[PDB]
Amino acid sequence: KRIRQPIIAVLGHVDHGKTTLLDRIRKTNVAAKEAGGITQHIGATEVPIEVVKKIAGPLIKLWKAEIKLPGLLFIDTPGHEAFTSLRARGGSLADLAVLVVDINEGFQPQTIESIEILRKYRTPFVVAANKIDRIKGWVIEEDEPFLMNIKKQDQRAVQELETKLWELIGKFYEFGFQANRFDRVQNFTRELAIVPISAKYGIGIAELLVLIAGLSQRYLEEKLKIEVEGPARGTILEVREEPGLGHTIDVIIYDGTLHKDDTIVVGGKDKAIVTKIRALLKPKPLDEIRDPRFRFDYVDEVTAAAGVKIAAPGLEEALAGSPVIAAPTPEDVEKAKQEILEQIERVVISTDKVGVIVKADTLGSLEALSKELQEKEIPIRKADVGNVSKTDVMEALSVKEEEPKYGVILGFNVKVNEDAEEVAKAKDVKIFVGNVIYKLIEDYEEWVKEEEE
Ligand SMILES: Nc1nc2c(ncn2[C@@H]2O[C@H](COP(=O)(O)OP(=O)(O)OP(=O)(O)O)[C@@H](O)[C@H]2O)c(=O)[nH]1
Ligand SMILES: [Mg+2]
Ligand code: NA
């Protein structure tokens, strides 16, 4: 019986510092390389317990109990308001969450939305009150524990931190939580612990990691979920074709044990795919599976929770955002297909049928672009995953007959088929493509405004 590696989801409002926090722990620069300077996908990173203990050093004694976890699997999530469905997926996967909140800006709309998600999935969480280094006159020392760094601050900075912390505590009370600075908490099951940190300079990461490990272990012990059992269950993050590996999928395995010869069922763009794994490859520890610096290593199995790449025949048509379910018998295959269909079908995007055509590369991207258009009262004709089809172009033309404004296709991280592009040129139907949600929408609006003039 192997010990579970817990999923730690990182949630919070746009720019409050989620990816910077993980980059400081990994010594990576994922945030610097994100297109459009925002997270737009779920990420997964293995942080071995040896790393936790090195960062924490003597502050591991902050937590009475011995930490027996093998490590932590951190799931990064988008803050941008459109990506509600990816924040929900991250919250639903988590054993414990880190709610990142800018101590200077305080609660904002996706802080509140994240809390509602954590309440919905009854996910325990710790709070990272980030960007303390912007308090006036703050004395920065890199990678210093908060309880050491706070001693370097003058009284004005200390008083400003406490004032801002009280604002956060009042906001948590508004939403039904008792919260305090982590070193003042008396009951870690009934109270929310707030760690003041600087993600960018590494202040307070030591105490934050000790609490994450301690509290996630406690959750798993309280639930009797610390031992991993059963066949593998996961969610697909990305579908890729890679030299020497073939068509692969990068996934999060959130329960059970995945083996390199397992039969699996995965969501597909047309229909469910039943295949047998031929290789598993695991990212290096501290490498973000969605933006890796290193090639992955072949492994025979992974135990939950883990990020892993799967090589198997027939994965070219796999659908990102859909389940991967190990299915060792025919009965299991039948069950897995229905569970996959339920997940796919449930993406419900209301369409006005005199509106825009929306295509995207993953289910999470399709939902985000759809949600953002609805918020902007841009009617949606149709929304589906995959490259722009000739049909998509013909449907857009029909809309164009009724209302040229909406006789358009928006393609989020997708390509245009050749016969679709031929027809679109001949019939003068516009197709917008992009890989940054806010820029794709701005491009569609700029085209609308400028055409009217
Ligand atoms: N001064 C300061 N800036 C920070 C800190 N943490 C993050 N930032 C900065 O805030 C900006 C946004 O940081 P990100 O890590 O992308 O924030 P995020 O929460 O992951 O953002 P989204 O994923 O798009 O919601 C960047 O310019 C970071 O350098 C911090 O501790 N101090
Ligand atoms: Mg981010
Ligand atoms: Na950002």
Curated annotation (Swiss-Prot):
It holds the Pfam family GTP_EFTU_D4. Transmembrane segments: none annotated. GTP binds at residues 76-80, 130-133. Residues 19-220 form the tr-type G domain. InterPro entries: EFTu-like_2, EFTU-type, Hint_dom_C, Hint_dom_N, Hint_dom_sf, Homing_endonucl, Intein_C, Intein_endonuc_central. SUPFAM superfamilies: Hedgehog/intein (Hint) domain (SSF51294), Initiation factor IF2/eIF5b, domain 3 (SSF52156), P-loop containing nucleoside triphosphate hydrolases (SSF52540), Translation proteins (SSF50447). HAMAP family: IF_2_A. This is Probable translation initiation factor IF-2, 2nd part. It comes from Pyrococcus abyssi (strain GE5 / Orsay).
